[PDB]
Amino acid sequence: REKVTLGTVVDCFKGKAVSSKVVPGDVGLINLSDMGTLGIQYHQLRTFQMDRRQLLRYLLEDGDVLIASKGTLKKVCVFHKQNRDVVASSNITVLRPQKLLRGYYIKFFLDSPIGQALLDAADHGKDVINLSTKELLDIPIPVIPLVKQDYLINHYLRGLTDYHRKLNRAEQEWEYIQNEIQKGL
């Protein structure tokens, strides 16, 4: 397969550095603690305030890949457009697809056995993570048809949404049985 280097198909920038002293405002914030394995935990995001000029630089758009560039866990999530303005924190590296590759397709590749190897080879930290943006952007990704990526992404998303269907229904039933008993007494 031919491969495009990540730096030739995405725009990459670190997230905004936000001090703990903020005015909870209107713009949402994604931090390491909001990066779950099943996506971003949009419901528990720390809100704050940012000027429009600086906010526009770090504003996130549908399909961005958020990568944990610090911490002890190399996580990778794709951003889904929300009803508010959301930016990522300085501990996260944003990849904005330009051409050819889908955000989720880059997510699958970096979640693959080889992806983790290439991500760990770009790490400058022994115990903590200190990802090297240059080495990150030298990562080669197989390049396939755009409709084929969409087809795998459409089904991946179907399984993720169905995964939440099943989990919520399994919990909703167990809670009903639990209450069928409590009322019995």
């Binding site: 920038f13 670190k14 550095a17 001090s19 000027d51 429009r52 000029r53 600086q54 526009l56 300085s90």
Partner: protein, 60 residues
């Protein structure tokens, strides 16, 4: 607030080219930079300063 990592990043990305840069100062201290096509608010004080010198003032 502008931090030292965001300014250098904009320089390595090619967004701040040349030896000078537009800088907004709040109450005398560095608040933000301004790129060619960005919007400066009516109430903000823009000065054109040197990148090496703006990079060293942030070091403190």
């Amino acid at each position: 607030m502008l931090y030292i990592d965001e300014f250098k990043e904009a320089i390595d990305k090619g967004y701040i080219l040349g030896d000078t840069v537009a800088i907004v100062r709040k109450n005398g201290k560095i608040f933000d930079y301004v790129l060619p096509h960005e919007k400066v608010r009516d109430d903000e004080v823009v000065t054109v300063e040197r990148v090496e010198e703006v990079m060293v003032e942030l070091d403190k």
